Amino acid sequence: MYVKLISSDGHEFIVKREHALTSGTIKAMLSNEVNFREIPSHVLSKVCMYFTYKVRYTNSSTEIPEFPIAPEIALELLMAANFLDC
């Protein structure tokens, strides 16, 4: 089961609902599509990678790789992550 997160510029990101629920904000918006008027797609795509990363590596004993963040998107990703509570 999937949900659709739409970026400020209209890109549609289709991710597993369980991955999207990493964000408590997204959980409330879903309780299915969500429109993010303030998160552009180059940020929202990284947020989606983060969900995948978080769900894959939470509770795993393997060595966990660093979640990589380009300096150029650090600030917007920070504000998106702050809003999304994740």
Partner 1 sequence: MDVFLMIRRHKTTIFTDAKESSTVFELKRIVEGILKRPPDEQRLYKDDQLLDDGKTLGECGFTSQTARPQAPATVGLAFRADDTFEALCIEPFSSPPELPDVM
Partner 2 sequence: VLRSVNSREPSQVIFCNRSPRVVLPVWLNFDGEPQPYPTLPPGTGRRIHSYRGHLWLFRDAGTHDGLLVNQTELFVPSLNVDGQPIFANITLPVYTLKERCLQVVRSLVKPENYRRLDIVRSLYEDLEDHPNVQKDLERLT
Q: How far is the CB of 28 from partner 1 (least distance, A)?
A: 21
Tell me if 37 contacts partner 2 by CB under 8 A: no
Pattern 11-50, partner 1, x by CB under 8 A: xxxxxx--x--------------------xxx--x--xxx
Chosen from partner 1, partner 2, none, partner binding at 11 (C-beta under 5 to 8 Å by type) = partner 1
Tell me if 82 contacts partner 2 by CB under 8 A: yes
Q: What radius of gyration do the chain's Cα atoms show?
A: 13
Cβ pair 6, 41 in contact under 8 A: no
Smallest Cα–Cα separation from 32: which of 51, 13, 4, 8? 4
Applying CB under 8 A, the residues found at the interface with partner 1 are 2, 7-16, 19, 40-42, 45, 48-53, 55-57, 65, 67-68, 70-76
